[model samples]
Target: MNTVPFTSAPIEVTIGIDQYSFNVKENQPFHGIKDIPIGHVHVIHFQHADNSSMRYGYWFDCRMGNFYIQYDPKDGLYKMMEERDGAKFENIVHNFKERQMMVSYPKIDEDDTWYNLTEFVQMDKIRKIVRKDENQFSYVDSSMTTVQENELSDPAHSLNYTVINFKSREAIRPGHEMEDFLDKSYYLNTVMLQGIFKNSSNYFGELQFAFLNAMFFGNYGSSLQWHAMIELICSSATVPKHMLDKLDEILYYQIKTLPEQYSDILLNERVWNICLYSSFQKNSLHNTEKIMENKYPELL
Candidate 1:
């Protein structure tokens, strides 16, 4: 298998005394968005599970193209985040320690404006942005802006997600309309991730974690959520094939621990597309484990 040579985008920001030392790569799909305000630096803080460390979430720039910040964990804080919005970033990271994070794009008409999904409170507004024919949610662009606030129109690298609050919809209207919207929205999430996995040769890494974050964003069982996560991690080249078994073992131990709720969300029900379902089945899993065992004995 040919590895894509690491492409670089130059970044220079300081976190305390640490100068930004990292790698950046072009975000190909959302290449020509020009709405980013001058001096806005969008930031995402990436911390591995197990309290390991933080790295740059994927970043996109009209001038710089789509890129991500890469830096050493030992450097402490990296340059991908705006110093002024440091407090907000700290709050978000502190809150969701176990889940993964990644960049996603949601096309809301030609307006091309982006928000974290949490900002929207009304169903009509979200419905207005969505269409039956077009996918309204995406895991593509990682906008990096430099604006500051608790939560404002201005940006200081915040984790803006596509929000679909299924339970709360009962208040909006009692029946069919709310269910349709939520179902469509949920299918949109499933389809987007399946697309990423299917077209993985072109789109990969951070995409995996970003989508996993989206799954965890929903109300779902912890064991089922992580079972889904490990599936995506297995999709990436970042985790070596030889290490797959160990990862499975770890997830199994984790699943055996504690979990509850979200029955039809992402775990037991048909939440994923058929392809994604088959791809994640126990047979496919056994194939992966066996591949790791026979192909690379040295790691074992």
Candidate 2:
């Protein structure tokens, strides 16, 4: 046995729906007592939790944010799962997989909050970290850029932007590098969410841009479009044309790709994103205003 005491590198996680990330050293609280329910940091744990086939109850907000992990001795991988009130937290699975760690958080109910927002992240000493492309959206801090670079490096990164071309009336063929740029561009994905949902049908790039961001990141990083739009649309429905074009594409793709059982959920999500274009655009503006106020208050 290596016989090393309980110590490993810091592990950072996207907490809940909003992806409020924080570093958990060998042993530390996730939010320092901040009880915001929907951070990317939803499923929080520690490096020590990765040791042994350790199954233990860790407290967060006076609830059992219990954690347990099994270390795959051969692969140098850690497989983990967390549960509270029988519902699994979904975001942790994404973070675990991206980090090259193994995790399971299965959803058992339609209303289950098992997965919120989990993305892959790589942790260095935080000093040796440097990236060629800066992560355009400043969510938490500069270390976030390092995390984004590492996530993109993974082959699984393609899962976030899966697409089908022929589904659209104004089809842009998949794998076409020109169109792929927007689908895969992290910077574009972030800002496109901020721009207004125009009524025109010409900007196919803008359509794809809005669709993918709303689909993958959820509206403004916290609320799922399918769930949010179901409520938001009933209040008012002013969806744009280009957005509808994209929804047509999404519906066809879901019909062709997903099973009949999942088609309702998939198509529901498709219709939902079209209705949510304005909401995301509004969210984007709110975030922008916050950033501007923090950095250049006098300019406003």
Candidate 3:
């Protein structure tokens, strides 16, 4: 394999009395590093002027495009570098002891934004901005300024929908009889569904719930509802777009093979159209309608 030379200049920063020098390099193989795991590059050596006993360093994973901060003293730092816009940097530091991550996004000439990762991930109505260096640092911008407590528009004040607990198999939403059937279907086909849920449990739960909700309660004629569901399933930070596309495929097959009784509602013309539309949007396949029509003439 080919390799690129490390070209970036070193950076020096002072924290308290410790003067630290950071040597950053890209496209270099992992070498001379012990204790740290293999398959990382863009290594940064954290050298202290005072010869501190603790050893610290940073490295980047090409596959995940995440920069990790690591150290040793019977403890270490593992953070996800969220953004690097010029001199400004955003990072998500994992506190292993506390079992939570800290988000830090520094603004130019302003104080850095710090918040617990737990506060932001599942919140609704809050828009997350993707940084320019998204490929390098998968940081979602979550700086909520106008949010007020006890406001009607506040996500915290919104009614919470009881989500399905996959483990217990209990509390599957009252009045939704299909939930019971779907729950059985899911377990019966665990081998197939496991592939769909492999990457992110959070995403899998949301997508599965959305699918179930839409199947039973959604209006087939409402283009907007289908569009929103498509957006929710397709666009997510937890899983990549390709994985979502695979999810769409698995769901399409699941819908296609439903029992005749359930098929009346789940496989109706409008529902089928929405499924086709989702496939068309994600795959951008030419003649998708024609292909579907040819494959399932009875359903179409």
Badly placed stretches (over 4 Å) of model 2 are: 1-67, 82-157, 160-287, 296-300
lDDT of 1 by residue, 1-300 (tens): 000011122232211101112222322211111123322223233333323322233222222223223334465333232223445534543333323232222223453122221111222222221222132221112232211222334332333322223334421344556553423323222433343323322122222223333333331222233343444443333333434543444323222221234223434322222212333333334543454344433333
All candidates: TM-score:
0.24, 0.24, 0.24
User: Which model is ahead, 1 or 3, in terms of lDDT?
Assistant: 3
Per candidate, the number of residue pairs that clash is 12, 18, 0
lDDT values of the candidates?
0.29, 0.28, 0.31
State the weakest 10-residue window (summed lDDT) of model 1.
1-10
- Of the candidates numbered 2 and 3, which has the greater lDDT value? 3
Candidate 2 vs. true structure, TM-score:
0.24
Give the per-residue lDDT digits (tens) of candidate 3, residues 25-69.
332221121122223222233333344433332223333422433
lDDT of 2 at 224: 29
After superposition, the stretches of candidate 3 with alpha carbons farther than 4 Å from their true spots are 1-201, 210-228, 231-239, 271-299
